[PDB]
């Protein structure tokens, strides 16, 4: 194609404008600043509660903002809202489609979303008039499997699907408001910033972008990984995030420095990381691998603090409460282990 | 107080409302075969049917895209993957069915699943053997040095030149199947026929053959 092979090279000439100024703004590394503070040690967490209610493998899980209730979606076709203090169930919602890949609990506590291979985000109303759990809306705009969804409030919800797009919905009108195009591979997980004005999204092209909710533009793109991204989570101040992938490596990126800081890899670990999450202070980076165990990483020294291995099958999710009190882990056996 | 022990008691009584429902739904889930139709409600295309008081559950995944390395991990707890293959500017689609089969057969999460593959549209192929003046061994050059196996059932009407081209593709999937399958999961090759009351029975007789081999490996008799 004429007047195009220079355009393909004008992009690679402009990526060299990125990667030299991104290198010129690297005074040191995250290791040799940190190496004066002393580490935490062996963090021996124990299974407190074990939630035995599903039938098939569990893909997702999301805590509530009171840090007491938690949704878990499993691919038997049902969605169960637990109670983490006393192991008893408060709801059990029969889904229409059996292959559910995500779930969310609204920050007010009134709504629960889900979604999967039916390409539809389904909103459920927990505080209805007569007393039931019936479908409020069915957000049908995506042309691919829905992999993650998170509420901003009770009115709007941002989703990420396997059609390489993210979308900002509006549950009252049922239709999209802003779509977020720009990824090349299937977007697997998003994570909201704490101020809910920005979010990031890791996809299967080894690149996690950064989106702006009110405008709809991708501000900056983070490429440090080798293989497909399976998880994402903000550092709790809103200026960094960690990124799990299939090359058995977490990477703590930074927004203002605009590049990777640290690399959480150990050579005895070869299998991919299903999910990631920080603690309340951000010192610990927990990360569930494709192997049946969960590894705590000290997110500043990049040394493995502790290992939490209470699962008989690959963990499919990972969630730390808003008060930081416990850690819930789900897996492909029908079990939710709560750790602290 | 009495009041906090009053709704704590009503919270535990919500278990018996739904743990009785979970045991009600555990019965219908375990006696239902979940299959997977993939060939080589707008997105999952679920299909229920009933063969001799046995519930089946099909899933057609045509509503998705074609980078299937992520959503195929959902389908590990299925009993069998039904894998239809069209036998037919020659795009070489038949090798594409071999490489997709080789990736399912070697996937880490799909190392326990048998494949029921239907070699389809031999009526389109039995014309293209005679009407093709050259051969279609230009794509498979190891076809001239291949003979029909003796333990074969050549149905009449088709030439042995068509029978040789029909069983060569079947052995080409078993050369992938028997390379690394090591007894955990097998392959059940078939040929498509009149669909009503004869093609679903081949799925039914193979899904008994998978579960009867499944328990016999739990008892280590196979």
């Amino acid at each position: 194609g004429s007047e195009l092979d220079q355009l393909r090279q004008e992009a690679e000439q402009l990526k060299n404008q990125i990667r030299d100024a991104r290198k010129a703004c690297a005074d040191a590394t995250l290791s040799q600043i940190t190496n004066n503070i002393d580490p935490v040690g062996r963090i021996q967490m124990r299974t407190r509660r074990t939630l035995r209610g599903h039938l098939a493998k569990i893909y997702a899980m999301h805590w509530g903002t009171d840090s007491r209730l938690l949704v878990s979606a499993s691919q038997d076709g049902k969605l169960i809202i637990w109670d983490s203090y006393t192991t008893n169930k408060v709801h059990a919602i029969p889904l229409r489609s059996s292959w559910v890949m995500t779930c969310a609990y609204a920050p007010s506590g009134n709504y629960v979303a889900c979604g999967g291979l039916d390409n539809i985000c389904s909103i459920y109303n927990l505080k209805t008039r007569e007393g039931n759990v019936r479908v409020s809306r069915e957000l049908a705009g995506h042309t691919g499997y829905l992999s993650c969804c998170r509420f901003l409030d009770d009115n709007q919800i941002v989703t990420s699907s396997g059609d390489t797009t993210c979308a900002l919905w509006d549950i009252e009108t049922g239709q999209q408001t802003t779509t977020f195009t720009g990824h090349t591979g299937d977007v697997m997980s998003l994570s909201l910033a704490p101020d809910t004005r920005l979010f990031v999204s890791g996809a299967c092209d080894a690149s996690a972008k950064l989106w702006d909710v009110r405008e709809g533009m991708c501000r900056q793109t983070f490429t440090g990984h080798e293989s497909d991204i399976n998880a994402i989570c903000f550092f709790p101040n809103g200026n960094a995030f960690a990124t799990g992938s299939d090359d058995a490596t977490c990477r703590l990126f930074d927004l203002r420095a605009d590049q990777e800081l640290m690399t959480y890899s150990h050579d005895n670990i070869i299998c991919g990381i299903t999910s990631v999450s920080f603690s309340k202070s951000g010192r610990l980076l927990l990360a569930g691998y494709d192997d049946f165990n969960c590894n705590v990483w000290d997110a500043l020294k990049a040394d493995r603090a502790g290992v939490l291995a209470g699962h008989d099958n690959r963990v499919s999710c990972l969630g730390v409460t808003d008060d930081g009190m416990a850690v819930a882990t789900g897996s492909w056996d029908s079990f939710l282990k709560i750790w602290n | 107080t009495e009041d906090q022990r009053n709704e704590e008691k009503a919270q535990r009584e919500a278990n018996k409302k739904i743990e009785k429902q979970l045991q009600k739904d555990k019965q219908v889930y375990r006696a239902t075969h979940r299959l997977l139709l993939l060939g080589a409600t707008s997105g999952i295309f679920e299909t229920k049917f009933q063969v001799d008081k046995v519930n089946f559950h099909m899933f057609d995944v045509g509503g998705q895209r074609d980078e299937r390395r992520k959503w195929i991990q959902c389908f590990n707890d299925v009993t069998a993957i039904i894998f239809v293959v069209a036998s037919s500017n020659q795009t070489n689609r038949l090798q594409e069915a071999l490489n997709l089969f080789k990736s399912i057969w070697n996937n880490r999460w799909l190392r326990t699943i048998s494949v029921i593959l239907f070699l389809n549209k031999q009526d389109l192929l039995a014309e293209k053997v005679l009407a093709g003046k050259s051969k279609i061994e230009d794509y498979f050059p190891e076809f001239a040095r291949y003979t029909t196996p003796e333990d074969a059932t050549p149905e009449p009407g088709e030439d042995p030149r068509v029978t040789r081209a029909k069983y060569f593709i079947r052995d080409e999937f078993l050369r992938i199947s028997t390379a690394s399958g090591d007894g955990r999961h097998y392959c059940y090759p078939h040929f498509t026929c009149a669909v009503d009351t004869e093609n679903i029975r081949r799925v039914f007789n193979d899904c008994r053959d998978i579960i009867q081999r499944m328990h016999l490996r739990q008892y280590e008799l196979l």
Partner: nanobody
Framework: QVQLQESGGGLVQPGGSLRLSCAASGFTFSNYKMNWVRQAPGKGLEWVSDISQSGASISYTGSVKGRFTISRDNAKNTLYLQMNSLKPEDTAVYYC?????????????????????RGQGTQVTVSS
């Protein structure tokens, strides 16, 4: 960034030989299952040849068996494809891909115009 920059490929009469090579950059090259993908004009993307994580297991399309030989040099991080005795219907655009995970044997890569870990293309033209 995972980048696959490739060279080689040009005008050649049928019977002649070429040599393609993509020097990979941005990942550990010794952990992935590299492979070549072909797209003829008017046709879909088509698989050509595999190579294992070290060089043990080698596969081919049947229509290129015996003519093409694939090679991997781990120390220089590049992937060779030695083509002998070209055909006039082998004129296409050749891509080198990789299988998306380390230490695996399965691959999902001969797909549509969207795929992440694929080179940009080298034109190979066989005519007279």
């Amino acid at each position: 960034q995972v980048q696959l920059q490739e060279s080689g490929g040009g005008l050649v009469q049928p019977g002649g030989s070429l040599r393609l090579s993509c020097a990979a950059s941005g990942f550990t090259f010794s952990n992935y299952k590299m492979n070549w993908v072909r797209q003829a004009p008017g046709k879909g993307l088509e698989w050509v040849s595999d190579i294992s994580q070290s060089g043990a297991s080698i596969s081919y399309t049947g229509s290129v068996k015996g003519r093409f030989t694939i090679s991997r040099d781990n120390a220089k991080n590049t992937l060779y494809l030695q083509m002998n005795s070209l055909k006039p219907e082998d004129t296409a655009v050749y891509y080198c891909a990789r299988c998306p995970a380390p230490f695996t044997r399965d691959c999902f890569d001969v797909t549509s115009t969207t795929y992440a870990y694929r080179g940009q293309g080298t034109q190979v033209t066989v005519s007279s």
